[PDB]
Structure formats: structure tokens, C-alpha cells
Write an enzyme that holds these catalytic residues in place. Structure first.
Site, PDB file in Angstrom:
ATOM      1  N   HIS A  53      -6.637 -20.961  48.563  1.00 12.31           N
ATOM      2  CA  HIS A  53      -5.706 -20.000  49.119  1.00 12.31           C
ATOM      3  C   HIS A  53      -6.439 -18.811  49.744  1.00 12.31           C
ATOM      4  O   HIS A  53      -6.139 -18.402  50.866  1.00 12.31           O
ATOM      5  CB  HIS A  53      -4.748 -19.584  47.997  1.00 12.31           C
ATOM      6  CG  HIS A  53      -4.077 -18.285  48.239  1.00 12.31           C
ATOM      7  ND1 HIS A  53      -4.604 -17.096  47.781  1.00 12.31           N
ATOM      8  CD2 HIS A  53      -2.987 -17.981  48.919  1.00 12.31           C
ATOM      9  CE1 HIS A  53      -3.826 -16.103  48.174  1.00 12.31           C
ATOM     10  NE2 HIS A  53      -2.842 -16.613  48.891  1.00 12.31           N
ATOM     11  N   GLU A 100      -4.791 -20.623  43.789  1.00 11.45           N
ATOM     12  CA  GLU A 100      -5.164 -19.280  44.180  1.00 11.45           C
ATOM     13  C   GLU A 100      -6.674 -19.247  44.115  1.00 11.45           C
ATOM     14  O   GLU A 100      -7.345 -18.867  45.076  1.00 11.45           O
ATOM     15  CB  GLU A 100      -4.637 -18.186  43.258  1.00 11.45           C
ATOM     16  CG  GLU A 100      -4.911 -16.826  43.876  1.00 11.45           C
ATOM     17  CD  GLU A 100      -4.685 -15.619  42.996  1.00 11.45           C
ATOM     18  OE1 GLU A 100      -4.161 -15.815  41.891  1.00 11.45           O
ATOM     19  OE2 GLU A 100      -5.040 -14.500  43.438  1.00 11.45           O
ATOM     20  N   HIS A 122       1.499 -20.485  53.777  1.00 12.65           N
ATOM     21  CA  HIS A 122       2.012 -20.454  52.417  1.00 12.65           C
ATOM     22  C   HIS A 122       2.994 -21.586  52.178  1.00 12.65           C
ATOM     23  O   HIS A 122       3.241 -21.974  51.033  1.00 12.65           O
ATOM     24  CB  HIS A 122       2.595 -19.082  52.089  1.00 12.65           C
ATOM     25  CG  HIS A 122       1.481 -18.259  51.605  1.00 12.65           C
ATOM     26  ND1 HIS A 122       1.160 -18.406  50.274  1.00 12.65           N
ATOM     27  CD2 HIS A 122       0.521 -17.520  52.161  1.00 12.65           C
ATOM     28  CE1 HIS A 122       0.087 -17.684  50.021  1.00 12.65           C
ATOM     29  NE2 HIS A 122      -0.313 -17.125  51.149  1.00 12.65           N
ATOM     30  N   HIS A 142      -6.941 -17.915  53.953  1.00 12.21           N
ATOM     31  CA  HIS A 142      -6.670 -16.609  54.515  1.00 12.21           C
ATOM     32  C   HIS A 142      -7.857 -16.138  55.343  1.00 12.21           C
ATOM     33  O   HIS A 142      -7.683 -15.729  56.488  1.00 12.21           O
ATOM     34  CB  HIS A 142      -6.393 -15.581  53.422  1.00 12.21           C
ATOM     35  CG  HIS A 142      -4.944 -15.382  53.166  1.00 12.21           C
ATOM     36  ND1 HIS A 142      -4.123 -14.619  53.962  1.00 12.21           N
ATOM     37  CD2 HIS A 142      -4.172 -15.860  52.183  1.00 12.21           C
ATOM     38  CE1 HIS A 142      -2.905 -14.632  53.443  1.00 12.21           C
ATOM     39  NE2 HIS A 142      -2.910 -15.373  52.364  1.00 12.21           N
TER      40      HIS A 142
HETATM   41 CU   LIG Z   1      -1.899 -15.893  50.611  1.00 16.63          CU
END
Ligand SMILES: [Cu+2]
Ligand SMILES: [Cu+2]
Lengths: 318, 340
Positions: free
Chosen positions: A22, A7, A62, A26
Site C-alpha cells: 500500500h 498496509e 484503494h 502510493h
Molecule cells: Cu493509501
């Protein structure tokens, strides 16, 4: 550790090294139309938590990430037969009952719900403004579970219910190497098991996976109306799985504000109430000689064919 | 003294000592050319084998290169170019046959080497040599099928042949039907591709590739132009051609292995037996696990995570856009040369 690295939360042990993978992906995926901001445009929907799940590429991104976590998961030792059996505890049966429908049948349909958008319509004249939303819904149901105890002593157990498709894309019975990743968590709760036979009834609207329907449409959780997959009009076949694990091993040392209170809220509760890995028992590769869910099952587990039916019709909410 | 024609005889019946005579010929080998086992029965040999033949081939005795490395692999052992040790052995035997000054000395050197070396290894190295020497071009090598059928045919047909050849006088003998679609049943959808996977032509193609573009040997044999790209392209056209067949058998495109840790679902039982090694190619059960290797004899001590590591290194190099030399110098994976 790996989830904090990927993350990239603050808790990542080395954000310089492993980066912010992550979040930045995005942002990358949301900026393909204007990556140097020469056209003075904002990010696409993938650049916003609020809206990212709208875009098909969310699942593609994902899934790419999941492959990294899976790469860790397959390194861990398969759960042993010892590690899975709850000695003395044996689940003989699970069925699902709905109202007006045959046993082992779930039902979905469409529903219309109204919501007051008045508190959100800036510079529009005051008063009720109702928006009618159309959305999936299922008919209420209950699990009935039969557990035989066999100890002379009371036994505590986590009831872990998952559901998956029976067959792959091509209508062929799925094998554990694939099925385990397709297991959808439906409920997890604690029970007390008297010696001998126990009959546990558990309603759908009790699921620890969900939150009330009232909280979506006028304590984190999945919306109640999306508990059950669409299914098909001719009937879609699934495998329902339940495991009763030994709570004396699953128990977490912390004692906070009847153990059976399983509603977990991350802000409220300091520690997660189950020592097992999230997704247990499907999170690892099968032990040697297990190829399919049929061979995986220990006595404290049970499997049932379930038919998920979709009716293409619209109800006003009752 | 058609050495070229005489060399072809070395492919005839690879497990038969060379003194037993090939086709209509026999070699007349020096006594120090026989093995230790058969030297004592030298007189008897001359009698049957030596006399019954039309053409007798004189072999001149010569001083011989050091054949230890090629002899170090056993006569009843199996031979694989994938195993580094065996590649190293083959490379050396190739160098030896390449380096003989003379086509006559090649004959003499090979005649000596043949009954002291693993036949599979002999076939390989000799072949690569004949294909590359100036003095042995235009030479019609026998198909590997013709000389080692044990690597191409259901092991069950050998006794069917042995019997037919032994009971029936030749002019009356019936062709033996080679089984097809014999490695698996209808319950394994993969059996549908028997005609691709188990076709002698495609397996010969894979074998021929390693004859022209060997991975270790003399520079002259190894260093072909753009051989790194042909490696890519050949393996790539196989998958393209394999998937074409899959689409014609109601199957999906082929799926990569996900990783090196999860079981391999599709097992395979080849139904082949090696008459050189008198040992089988053991099948692989369904749902088998890749396991860390510790093969003392093969000289392979290698963990799965050692393979994971190379792959990681390679991916980093592809993403960086260059590989790093043994010295630390960068070689760019550009458009012309990157794929090679
Ligand atoms: Cu995400
Ligand atoms: Cu190859």
C-alpha cells in the site's frame, strides 16, 4: 492480519514476503515524473498522507486494494438467519425528520466558514488573517426508530445505521451483491430496550461516525458537514437501513472507564467495543436465497426510502 | 466405389442403425458387423431395408482396431469436449480413423464403429478425420445442424415435425417455423441478444473451431501454427463483437466474473433436449453459486480453489515474463511467441 500485511505496518507477520504494498504503491504513483530523481523533484500529492485524498487516483488505488480484502471477505460463510435475528426484538420503523422539511428527506447546501491562518503565516506581520472556505453542509436531522421488545426482560442492542443508493448508475433498483458494498455507516450506538414498545430519537450531531463541526472549523472521526452525501436538486433516492443486533453477543469482555458511552478513541481505549466485524452485517455475501435488501432483512432490521435533496445556495454559518 | 460419397451417408440419421439405409443406398454389412442386439433379426432386416434401395454398398470385412476406449462412453450419454475424459476418448477415436491405411478400410471401420458409439462423439471424431486425411479432402460435410437439430432448436418443435411428417404426405408439408427469442422474456434484458447467442451460425463457428484446432489428438491435427494465439484472438473478437451488439441493445459492455465465489446473477434456461441422451441441458437459476466438483463418472474431482490456484500460477507467470517447464526450465513470454 491481512490489513497489517497489506498496509505493512510493523505488525505484519512477514514483511519480507508480503512486502509493503500500500505505502509503496502510493510512492510509485507519486513519482512518475521523476522516478530516478535525476530532475531533483519531490513526490506528487499521492506521496503525502496530508494531501493524497485530493487526487482521483487515490480512489482507483484503494479500490484495487479493496478487491484484495473483498477476495478474503467472500470466502467467509454468509451470516445465517440465526446469526442475524435478535429473538424477541423487532424493528417496525425508522424515519428521518429535519426542520421545515417533509419526513424522510435529507437536505444539503453550501456553507462558508472562516479560519484563522495567522499561526501559519511565517514571516508575515502578526494579527488575524481569515480565510473563507466553501464546503458542503447538511441541515440537522434526527432518526426516529420504533422497536418492539416482546421479552419480559430488558434487552441491550447495538443500533447500526447505514445508508446506500437505491439505484445503480442506470436508475435500476440495486441488488444485494452490489448494494452491500455501497452501504455507508451513519451511526452505531448502544441502547437499552424496555419490554414492549420503545421509541428512540437520535440526532445527527450524535453520530459516532463523526466528530463536532467545531473541531474542523474554529477521538478520530469523520467531519460532521460531510455526514450526508450531496444528493441531487431534483431529489436523489437512497435506502436507509438499521439493524438492532444482540449486544450480549456483540459485547467485548474488557471493562474500562454506563455501557452507552460509545465514543471510541483508539489511544484512549485498549479494545474495540464491538466483537462483530467492522461493517457488519454487510461485510459478507448473502446467505442462500437473498438477492436484495428486501429479502436480507430480519425482523430486528428495518428499511426506509429517503430523498436526499441538494440546494445550490450559500449560507453564512448561523 | 465412391467411398467418399458413401462416407457422407454415415452422417445421415445418426441414431438409426446403419443397416436401415441412408438416402437411396443401403450398406451390405457382414454379420459380425451387426450388434449383438440386432444380429438375431438379421434376416428380417435384409427384407425391408436391404431391398427397397437403388444402390447397395458392399462392405469388405477387415481386422479392426481396438474400439474399447471410444465405446466406453454410453450411447444414451452426453458428450463434451470440455470434460477431459471425453477429450481423451475423442482423441483416440480420431487417431483410429486417421490411421486406417485405406479409404476403403475407413468405410469398413466406420460402418462397424457407428452403431457401437455415441453419435455425437462419432460425428466429431469422424469429421476431424475427414477434414485432415489426404484421401478425404474437398468433401462436403453436412452441417451439424442438419444432422443434430436437437442441439440448435427449441425442443418443442420435434413433435410438431413428427406430427406433420406423419399426418401429411410430403408434397403438401409446411415448413416448421423455428422460434426466436424464446429462452427468456422482456423482464430479462439479456434476452435482447438472442440473435447473437442463439444463432446457428455463431454456434457452428464455435463448433467448427474445435474441429480444426482440436485440443487432443494426433500431432498432425493438434499442432497448427500459432494455434495458442488464434485461441486468444478468436475468443477476443467474440467479446469485441458481443459488446458491439450490447451497445446496440441499450446494455453495458460485458462484465467479467468478479471472482469464483460470488453468485452468478444472470441465469439461463436453454430450452434444448438431447434425443441422443434423452436428457436436457439443465438451466441455471438466477444467482447460482459455483460449486466444488466431484463427478465420479466424468472423472473430475476438482475444488474451486484448484481453479483459483491455476489462475494465480498463470498471473505469476505473466508478471515474471516466463513460464516454467515441467523440468524447471524457463520459456520466455517474448513479443513473438508469448501470446501463443
Ligand atoms: Cu493509501
Ligand atoms: Cu472455444
Amino acid at each position: 492480519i491481512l490489513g497489517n500485511i497489506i498496509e505493512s505496518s510493523i505488525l505484519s507477520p512477514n514483511r519480507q514476503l508480503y512486502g509493503d504494498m500500500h505505502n509503496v504503491g502510493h510512492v510509485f504513483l507519486s513519482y512518475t515524473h521523476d522516478p530516478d530523481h535525476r530532475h531533483l523533484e519531490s513526490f506528487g500529492v499521492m506521496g503525502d498522507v496530508a494531501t493524497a485524498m485530493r487526487d482521483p487516483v487515490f480512489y482507483r488505488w484503494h479500490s484495487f486494494i479493496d478487491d484484495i480484502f473483498q477476495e478474503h471477505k467472500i470466502k467467509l460463510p454468509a451470516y445465517t438467519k440465526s446469526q442475524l435475528t435478535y429473538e424477541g426484538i423487532s424493528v417496525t420503523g425508522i424515519i428521518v425528520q429535519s426542520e421545515g422539511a417533509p419526513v424522510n428527506t435529507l437536505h444539503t447546501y453550501w456553507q462558508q466558514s472562516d479560519v484563522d491562518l495567522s499561526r501559519g503565516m511565517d514571516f508575515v506581520p502578526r494579527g488575524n488573517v481569515f480565510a473563507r472556505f466553501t464546503h458542503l453542509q447538511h441541515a440537522p436531522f434526527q432518526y426516529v426508530i420504533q422497536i418492539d421488545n416482546t421479552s419480559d426482560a430488558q434487552r441491550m442492542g447495538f443500533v447500526r445505521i447505514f445508508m446506500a443508493p437505491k439505484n445503480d448508475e442506470r436508475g435500476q433498483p440495486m441488488l444485494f451483491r452490489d448494494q452491500r458494498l455501497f452501504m455507508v455507516e451513519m451511526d452505531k450506538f448502544l441502547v437499552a430496550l424496555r419490554p414492549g414498545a420503545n421509541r428512540i430519537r437520535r440526532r445527527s450531531n450524535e453520530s459516532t461516525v463523526t466528530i463536532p463541526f467545531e473541531r474542523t472549523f474554529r477521538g478520530c472521526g469523520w467531519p460532521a458537514h460531510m455526514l450526508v452525501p450531496k444528493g441531487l436538486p431534483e431529489g436523489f433516492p437512497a435506502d436507509l437501513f438499521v439493524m438492532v443486533s444482540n449486544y450480549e453477543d456483540d459485547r467485548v469482555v474488557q471493562d474500562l472507564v454506563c455501557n452507552d458511552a460509545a465514543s471510541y478513541c483508539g489511544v484512549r481505549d485498549r479494545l474495540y467495543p464491538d466483537r462483530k466485524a467492522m461493517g457488519f452485517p454487510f461485510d459478507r455475501l448473502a446467505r442462500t436465497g437473498v438477492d436484495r435488501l428486501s429479502n436480507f432483512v430480519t425482523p430486528n432490521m428495518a428499511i426506509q426510502s429517503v430523498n436526499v435533496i441538494h440546494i445550490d445556495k450559500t449560507v453564512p454559518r448561523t | 466405389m465412391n467411398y467418399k460419397k458413401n462416407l457422407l451417408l454415415l452422417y445421415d440419421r445418426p441414431r438409426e442403425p446403419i443397416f436401415m439405409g441412408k438416402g437411396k443406398s443401403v450398406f451390405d454389412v457382414p454379420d459380425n458387423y451387426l450388434t449383438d442386439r440386432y444380429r438375431p433379426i438379421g434376416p428380417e432386416i435384409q427384407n425391408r431395408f436391404g431391398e427397397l434401395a437403388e444402390e447397395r454398398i458392399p462392405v469388405r470385412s477387415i481386422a479392426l482396431p481396438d474400439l474399447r476406449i471410444p465405446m466406453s462412453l454410453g450411447r444414451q450419454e452426453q458428450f463434451s469436449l470440455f470434460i477431459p475424459r471425453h477429450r481423451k476418448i475423442a482423441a483416440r477415436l480420431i487417431d483410429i480413423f486417421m490411421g486406417m491405411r485405406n479409404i476403403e478400410e475407413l468405410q469398413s471401420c466406420a460402418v462397424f464403429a457407428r452403431d457401437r458409439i455415441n453419435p455425437y462423439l462419432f460425428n466429431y471424431a469422424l469429421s476431424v478425420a475427414l477434414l485432415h486425411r489426404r484421401d478425404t479432402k474437398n468433401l462436403d460435410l453436412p452441417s451439424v445442424v442438419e444432422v443434430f437439430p436437437d442441439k440448435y432448436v427449441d425442443s418443442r418443435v420435434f413433435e410438431q415435425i413428427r406430427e406433420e411428417a406423419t399426418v401429411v404426405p410430403e408434397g403438401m408439408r409446411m415448413p416448421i417455423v423455428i422460434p426466436k427469442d424464446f429462452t427468456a422474456s422482456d423482464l430479462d434484458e439479456e434476452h435482447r441478444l438472442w440473435y447473437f447467442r442463439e444463432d446457428i451460425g455463431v454456434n457452428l463457428h464455435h463448433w467448427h473451431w474445435h474441429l480444426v484446432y482440436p485440443g487432443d489428438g494426433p500431432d498432425s491435427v493438434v499442432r497448427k501454427d500459432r494455434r495458442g494465439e488464434l485461441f486468444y484472438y478468436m475468443h477476443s473478437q467474440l467479446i469485441a463483437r458481443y459488446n458491439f451488439e450490447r451497445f446496440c441493445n441499450r446494455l453495458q459492455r460485458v462484465k467479467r466474473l468478479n471472482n469464483l465465489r460470488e453468485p452468478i446473477a444472470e441465469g439461463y434456461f436453454p430450452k434444448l433436449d438431447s434425443l441422443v441422451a434423452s436428457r436436457t441441458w439443465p438451466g441455471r437459476v438466477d444467482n447460482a453459486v459455483i460449486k466444488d466438483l466431484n463427478r465420479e463418472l466424468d472423472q473430475i474431482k476438482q475444488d474451486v480453489s484448484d481453479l483459483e490456484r491455476w489462475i494465480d500460477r498463470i498471473y505469476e507467470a505473466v508478471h515474471q515474463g516466463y513460464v516454467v517447464d515441467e523440468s524447471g526450465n524457463r520459456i520466455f513470454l517474448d513479443e513473438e511467441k508469448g501470446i501463443d
